[PDB]
Amino acid sequence: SSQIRQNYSTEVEAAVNRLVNLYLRASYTYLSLGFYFDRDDVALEGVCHFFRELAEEKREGAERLLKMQNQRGGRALFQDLQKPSQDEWGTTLDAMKAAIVLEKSLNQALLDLAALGSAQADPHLCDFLESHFLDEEVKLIKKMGDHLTNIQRLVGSQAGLGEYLFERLTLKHD
Amino acid sequence: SSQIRQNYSTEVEAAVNRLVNLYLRASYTYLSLGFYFDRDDVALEGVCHFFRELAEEKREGAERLLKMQNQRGGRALFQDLQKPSQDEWGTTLDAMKAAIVLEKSLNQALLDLAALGSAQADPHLCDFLESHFLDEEVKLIKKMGDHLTNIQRLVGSQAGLGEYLFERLTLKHD
Amino acid sequence: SSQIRQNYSTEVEAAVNRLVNLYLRASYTYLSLGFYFDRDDVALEGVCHFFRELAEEKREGAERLLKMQNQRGGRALFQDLQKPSQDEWGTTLDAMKAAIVLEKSLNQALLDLAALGSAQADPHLCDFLESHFLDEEVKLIKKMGDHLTNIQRLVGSQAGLGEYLFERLTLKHD
Amino acid sequence: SSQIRQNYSTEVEAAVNRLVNLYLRASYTYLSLGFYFDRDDVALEGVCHFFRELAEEKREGAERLLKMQNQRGGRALFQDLQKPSQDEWGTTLDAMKAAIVLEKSLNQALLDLAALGSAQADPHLCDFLESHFLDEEVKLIKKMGDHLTNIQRLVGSQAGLGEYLFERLTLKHD
Numbered sequence: 264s265s266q267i268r269q270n271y272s273t274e275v276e277a278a279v280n281r282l283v284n285l286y287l288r289a290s291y292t293y294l295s296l297g298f299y300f301d302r303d304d305v306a307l308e309g310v311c312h313f314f315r316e317l318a319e320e321k322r323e324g325a326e327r328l329l330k331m332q333n334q335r336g337g338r339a340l341f342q343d344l345q346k347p348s349q350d351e352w353g354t355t356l357d358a359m360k361a362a363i364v365l366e367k368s369l370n371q372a373l374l375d376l377a378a379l380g381s382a383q384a385d386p387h388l389c390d391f392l393e394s395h396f397l398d399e400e401v402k403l404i405k406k407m408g409d410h411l412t413n414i415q416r417l418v419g420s421q422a423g424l425g426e427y428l429f430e431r432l433t434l435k436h437d
Numbered sequence: 438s439s440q441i442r443q444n445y446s447t448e449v450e451a452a453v454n455r456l457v458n459l460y461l462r463a464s465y466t467y468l469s470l471g472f473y474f475d476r477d478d479v480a481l482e483g484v485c486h487f488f489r490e491l492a493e494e495k496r497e498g499a500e501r502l503l504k505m506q507n508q509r510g511g512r513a514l515f516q517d518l519q520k521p522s523q524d525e526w527g528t529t530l531d532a533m534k535a536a537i538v539l540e541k542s543l544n545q546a547l548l549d550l551a552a553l554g555s556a557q558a559d560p561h562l563c564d565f566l567e568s569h570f571l572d573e574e575v576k577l578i579k580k581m582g583d584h585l586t587n588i589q590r591l592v593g594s595q596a597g598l599g600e601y602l603f604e605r606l607t608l609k610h611d
Numbered sequence: 612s613s614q615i616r617q618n619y620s621t622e623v624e625a626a627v628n629r630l631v632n633l634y635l636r637a638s639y640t641y642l643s644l645g646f647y648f649d650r651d652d653v654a655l656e657g658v659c660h661f662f663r664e665l666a667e668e669k670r671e672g673a674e675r676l677l678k679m680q681n682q683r684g685g686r687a688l689f690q691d692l693q694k695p696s697q698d699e700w701g702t703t704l705d706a707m708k709a710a711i712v713l714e715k716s717l718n719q720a721l722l723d724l725a726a727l728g729s730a731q732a733d734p735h736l737c738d739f740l741e742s743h744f745l746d747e748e749v750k751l752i753k754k755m756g757d758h759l760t761n762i763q764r765l766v767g768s769q770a771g772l773g774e775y776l777f778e779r780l781t782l783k784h785d
Numbered sequence: 786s787s788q789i790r791q792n793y794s795t796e797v798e799a800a801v802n803r804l805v806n807l808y809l810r811a812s813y814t815y816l817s818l819g820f821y822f823d824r825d826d827v828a829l830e831g832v833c834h835f836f837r838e839l840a841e842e843k844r845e846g847a848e849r850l851l852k853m854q855n856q857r858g859g860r861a862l863f864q865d866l867q868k869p870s871q872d873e874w875g876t877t878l879d880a881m882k883a884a885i886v887l888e889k890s891l892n893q894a895l896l897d898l899a900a901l902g903s904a905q906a907d908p909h910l911c912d913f914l915e916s917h918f919l920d921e922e923v924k925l926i927k928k929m930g931d932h933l934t935n936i937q938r939l940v941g942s943q944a945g946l947g948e949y950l951f952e953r954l955t956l957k958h959d
């Protein structure tokens with residue numbers, strides 16, 4: 264069973280398993296975004312790379328939560344993973360707007376879990392989120408917000424031109 | 438406007454702007470202390486260097502707060518910067534006593550902001566202060582306290598001798 | 612008191628202290644400009660970097676004046692530092708126009724002090740300004756003028772596009 | 786005769802020859818100071834080294850003036866060199882006080898020559914002094930003033946102790 268568990272509430276254990284599901288769902292959403300931008304009829308390499316990187320980051324976040332669950336003596340429980348909300352993701356702008364929505368939802372889940380940890384007097388959990396998740400999320404949301412502003416200023420009356428230039432001159436590509 | 442702000446209270450935003458002012462004021466105080474000890478009629482190089490270093494440290498603390506303000510989606514607001522409390526700073530002892538007073542005031546402002554963060558359930562802010570400010574301040578206050586004790590033991594009946602020896606043998610100089 | 616002062620007028624001493632205030636004010640203005648361009652709703656990294664660099668340059672100019680004040684046996688006297696003239700700085704164009712205004716004001720103050728030095732038969736002061744300030748200021752004003760022309764030619768009927776392209780292709784960024 | 790002389794007044798030529806004499810006299814004074822501090826009954830190595838270095842510096846200043854005299858097409862004219870004002874130089878304090886007097890006299894001679902150059906519309910001469918002499922002299926006087934303050938604070942009621950400590954802990958020695 265366990266022999267190590269100490270100060271680790273059933274409420275936190277369940278919430279961690281839920282958060283793993285949310286991160287894996289987010290990873291799957293980013294996988295879909297990445298491959299949409301690799302379509303020959305979309306063909307925005309830097310946009311593809313941006314979202315493929317996020318798919319890996321979210322998977323790694325789920326793995327870190329699972330490692331922690333076992334370190335505390337809780338039990339990983341996996342649930343079905345829903346498919347992403349869209350099959351096609353529109354423009355770079357549409358995609359970046361969907362990404363910031365998704366990140367705000369993950370951030371709120373992190374904050375909710377931090378608040379649960381405080382309520383449960385679980386300082387290890389609170390430390391864990393502060394150390395590996397909260398600032399990573401703030402940094403990423405700031406980056407997306409920066410990108411949104413630049414994408415928006417490039418729409419002008421020549422959306423295609425602006426979308427190409429943003430991909431070429433802001434996003435990382437070969 | 439903002440598109441990134443989340444869980445970032447107006448109260449914290451304002452308090453961060455106030456703390457920026459306090460750090461910039463402290464930086465200005467240390468600039469004045471540094472140049473006083475470079476006067477030809479004062480001429481204590483190690484004391485000059487000690488306070489010039491602190492002027493840079495406090496400026497960098499203000500810059501880190503400003504970076505964080507933008508990362509969270511708050512808005513930097515700058516106010517007039519008051520001049521330092523003195524134009525001449527007395528002996529090394531007088532200066533180190535003024536410095537520890539100043540640092541206690543910064544430390545209390547940090548603690549007040551940490552308490553506001555806890556009240557507002559803002560774990561990112563609390564993490565931020567713990568990571569970059571609270572221990573730096575404890576370390577610095579301990580160092581100043583150590584220096585005060587050594588300065589005090591050197592006063593004896595030969596203050597000039599003790600002030601020279603402390604500058605030469607404790608403080609870093611060329 | 613002093614034992615080193617020679618050929619260093621009270622008029623120059625006071626004017627140097629005033630010029631220190633002007634440089635520190637300019638540094639503060641550039642700090643504000645830099646952080647405005649780091650806002651997520653502005654997000655022009657190269658513009659941010661340009662003005663953050665100038666904030667450091669102006670601080671260093673103030674420090675060089677203070678060092679010189681002590682080398683000549685004058686006494687640094689610090690005054691309150693007024694906040695910058697604006698809290699928000701508009702477009703890159705608006706900001707660069709404000710910067711060239713500011714630099715012209717610093718340049719005129721330098722020239723006024725050079726003329727005072729000549730009047731007071733203070734060749735060390737005149738040398739000092741020529742060596743460390745006058746050409747640095749001419750170079751910087753020429754650079755800003757160059758930038759203004761390029762910004763202006765990019766406005767066209769697509770201001771957002773031009774502002775992005777200038778930041779990407781002229782200014783230094785990561 | 787000359788074939789190169791241009792814009793080089795007889796007044797400046799004579800004043801340069803006088804200044805050469807003043808620098809060589811100063812060099813001789815420092816030679817005497819250096820060897821006094823090497824006496825077995827004085828024995829302050831760092832003080833000896835300080836003044837021996839200045840003897841070389843003043844000789845080199847005289848050589849630079851002579852080189853310039855020939856570059857401009859003037860004619861070096863050498864006069865008798867008076868012996869130093871003292872045969873024995875007292876304490877480190879007495880010596881440093883005599884040195885700052887001497888340096889103030891050289892500085893005034895430099896300033897007088899700079900003013901003569903301006904009067905004669907001789908910008909090469911004015912540049913020459915600014916480039917190689919005026920700031921070197923300000924720097925040296927500031928250093929001596931710094932030393933005087935430290936020597937004075939060490940007198941206390943134990944002059945011998947203070948004189949030893951200054952030599953050991955401020956001045957450069959083997």
Ligand SMILES: [Cl-]
Pocket residue numbers: 345346
């Ligand atoms: Cl579904």
Ligand SMILES: [Cl-]
Pocket residue numbers: 519520691
């Ligand atoms: Cl005040």
Ligand SMILES: [Cl-]
Pocket residue numbers: 517693694
């Ligand atoms: Cl104001």
Ligand SMILES: [Cl-]
Pocket residue numbers: 867868
């Ligand atoms: Cl004689």
